[PDB]
Design a protein around this ligand. Structure first.
Ligand SMILES: O=C(O)CCCCc1cccc2ccccc12
Ligand SMILES: *[C@@H]1O[C@H](CO)[C@@H](O)[C@H](O)[C@H]1NC(C)=O
Length: 343
């Protein structure tokens, strides 16, 4: 079980001004630290943030969080469930900022909600150094869905924060699960681009520095898209992405005749193309959403290699390897052409 700590700096808050926090399970003598960013969509204006506060309040407030959480999947401490990092220090960072982990804006007289995702991550990293993170060799910043995109937006800032804090020996790495999206055309029109452009303004959202310098003012929304932000990042990042992600299909208004068949097959081919130059990646041809904190995340395989194995091989490469691949992208063109897809 992971134990809740609310942030001692209570100026770093969830949407409604309640303190943000993290769940921690320490593993003595391990120098590996896994900080996992929860996902759960976002809200981009007052009206739809008000709606989310009614029916998704735990994603906007710590007032009702439980004292504990069970670590599952890559957060499990049992080798049977987590062959990769079962002995690591485990941190689960609840998503309570509704900003894809990009915000740095306090709740004030002019803002009904605080959007502080990017500062929550920094504050968690700050307060953990006193609980053992100072001795770490590896800090793996992981995340699923909106949290996977949050890895891409924050991993280099976590590295820079630890460098200027005097810890250049901590190797910061990223693991982005189901946060690698395409700014593509919808199957039936009316869409992520405009929602993110409004979100960034509404949140005062911040993006990684080099990506921001390429796309410049007014165009920061581009850096929320994995295939655009990833080549600008310095930290090593492992990308896990279903070829037919359910959240991708949702925003594409896909819920089978030729037109839809071609649209789906072209989507999978476009996703494969954006991953061709990502050296550490795991991308199975399944219709699904998230994987790394699911208890049965050991079950899926690409070209006969599981995700926990691919992650271990990635570890080794950061010391090609024989029989230990790190780039695993399905080539088959339709959901569940991979037989190990989740049922
Ligand atoms: O958090 C979840 O479960 C949903 C997935 C994350 C939100 C999201 C959905 C669709 C497209 C996106 C594009 C960029 C960032 C985020 C995008
Ligand atoms: C608390 O967090 C805010 C936001 O990052 C920061 O401006 C302030 O310096 C922090 N205070 C302390 C005591 O850490």
């Amino acid at each position: 079980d992971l134990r809740l700590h609310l942030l001692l700096n209570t100026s770093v808050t969830c949407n409604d001004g309640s303190p943000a926090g993290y769940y921690l399970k320490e593993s003595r003598g391990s120098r590996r630290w896994l900080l996992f960013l929860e996902g759960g969509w976002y809200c981009f204006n007052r009206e739809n943030c008000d709606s989310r506060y009614d029916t998704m309040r735990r994603l906007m407030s710590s007032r009702d969080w439980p004292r504990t959480r069970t670590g599952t999947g890559i957060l499990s401490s049992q080798p049977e469930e987590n062959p990769y990092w079962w002995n690591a220090n485990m941190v689960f960072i609840p998503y309570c900022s509704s900003d894809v982990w990009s915000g740095a804006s306090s709740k004030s007289e002019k803002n009904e909600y605080a959007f502080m995702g990017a500062l929550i991550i920094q504050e968690v990293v700050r307060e953990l150094l006193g609980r053992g993170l100072s001795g770490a060799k590896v800090l793996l910043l992981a995340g699923s869905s909106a949290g996977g995109t949050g890895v891409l937006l924050n991993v280099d800032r976590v590295a820079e924060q630890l460098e200027k804090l005097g810890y250049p020996a901590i190797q910061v790495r990223g693991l982005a699960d189901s946060g690698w999206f395409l700014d593509n055309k919808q199957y039936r029109h009316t869409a992520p681009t405009e929602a993110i452009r409004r979100g960034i303004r509404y949140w005062n959202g911040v993006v990684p520095e080099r990506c921001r310098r390429q796309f410049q003012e007014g165009e920061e929304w581009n850096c929320f898209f994995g295939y655009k932000v990833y080549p600008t990042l310095r930290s090593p990042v492992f990308v896990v992405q279903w070829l037919f992600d359910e959240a991708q299909l949702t925003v594409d208004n896909v819920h089978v005749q030729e037109g839809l068949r071609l649209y789906i097959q072209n989507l999978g081919r476009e996703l494969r193309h954006t991953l061709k130059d990502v050296p550490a990646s795991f991308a199975p041809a399944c219709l699904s959403h998230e994987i790394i904190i699911r208890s049965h995340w050991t079950d899926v395989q690409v070209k006969g290699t599981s995700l926990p194995r691919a992650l271990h091989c990635w570890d080794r490469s950061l010391h090609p390897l024989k029989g230990c691949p790190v780039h695993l992208v399905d080539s088959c063109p339709w959901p569940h052409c991979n037989p190990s897809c989740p049922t």
